[PDB]
Design a protein around this ligand. Structure first.
Ligand SMILES: [Zn+2]
Length: 258
């Protein structure tokens, strides 16, 4: 049937339906912190989430997406490596079955417990569907999660998951402030890459924050109670929904910090 994260339909299978899986600018990647080069030409990064308008949360059978109203310039990312303005459309996470895995990007081969992806599209292409087809169409802000202290800003997400346990379930999810999911530092690495789920389009400027956020064990345990399967189908816990690191292929990872 269709793509997923198991033995028979997982990442190692995706190239058959999506041949770009073996392409030249796939994500995620391992971030070698020693070979990443400080780039003085990077402009400062501007994360402007004050007027962000969340609409709904959805279990799509792979993750859950918190969706935003992107009909106007409300929540936008600009600066850093980017030209122009990138509008926030949704965020989601990738996580593990255990705390020792779950992130997509790795840092000197280190795997974090989870990874948050704030997905934005370049306004110069008018809508998400057109932007995701262009080499500079998307910008994903990636944030690592480690298990430690609770993240108070995540708790509203955590509490709604019981209502979207299975594939195809959604719920109203208004007034969620994504500022509550950001670490203190905006120090980042950047490189040109791709979507990490099918169709794996090579349209993304990746901006991966160096500083992880801490979430509690109880919080991530609640992510792990979600299901990949639909209602009244055999239960398959939604865990290990991460694509592993892909070949860098001579791409250059740039650091914003010395
Ligand atoms: Zn993602």
């Amino acid at each position: 049937h269709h793509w997923g994260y198991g033995k028979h339909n997982g990442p190692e299978h995706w190239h058959k339906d999506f041949p770009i899986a073996k392409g030249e600018r796939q994500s995620p990647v391992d971030i070698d912190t020693h070979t990443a080069k400080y780039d003085p030409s990077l402009k400062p990064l501007s994360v402007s989430y004050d007027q962000a308008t969340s609409l709904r949360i959805l279990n799509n059978g792979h993750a859950f997406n918190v969706e935003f109203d992107d009909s106007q310039d409300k929540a936008v990312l600009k600066g850093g490596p980017l030209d122009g303005t990138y509008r926030l459309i949704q965020f989601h996470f990738h996580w593990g079955s255990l705390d020792g895995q779950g992130s997509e990007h790795t840092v000197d081969k280190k795997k974090y417990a989870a990874e948050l992806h704030l997905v934005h599209w370049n306004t110069k292409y008018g809508d998400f569907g057109k932007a995701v087809q262009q080499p500079d169409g998307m910008a994903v802000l990636g944030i690592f999660l480690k298990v430690g202290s609770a993240k108070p800003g995540l708790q509203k997400v955590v509490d709604v998951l019981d209502s979207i346990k299975t594939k195809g379930k959604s719920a109203d999810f208004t007034n969620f402030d994504p500022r509550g999911l950001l670490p203190e530092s905006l120090d980042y690495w950047t490189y040109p890459g791709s979507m990490t789920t099918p169709p794996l389009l090579e349209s993304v400027t990746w901006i991966v924050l160096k500083e992880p956020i801490s979430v509690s064990s109880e919080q991530v345990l609640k992510f792990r109670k979600l299901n990949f399967n639909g209602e009244g189908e055999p239960e398959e816990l939604m865990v290990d929904n991460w694509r592993p690191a892909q070949p860098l292929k001579l791409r250059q990872i740039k650091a914003s910090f010395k």
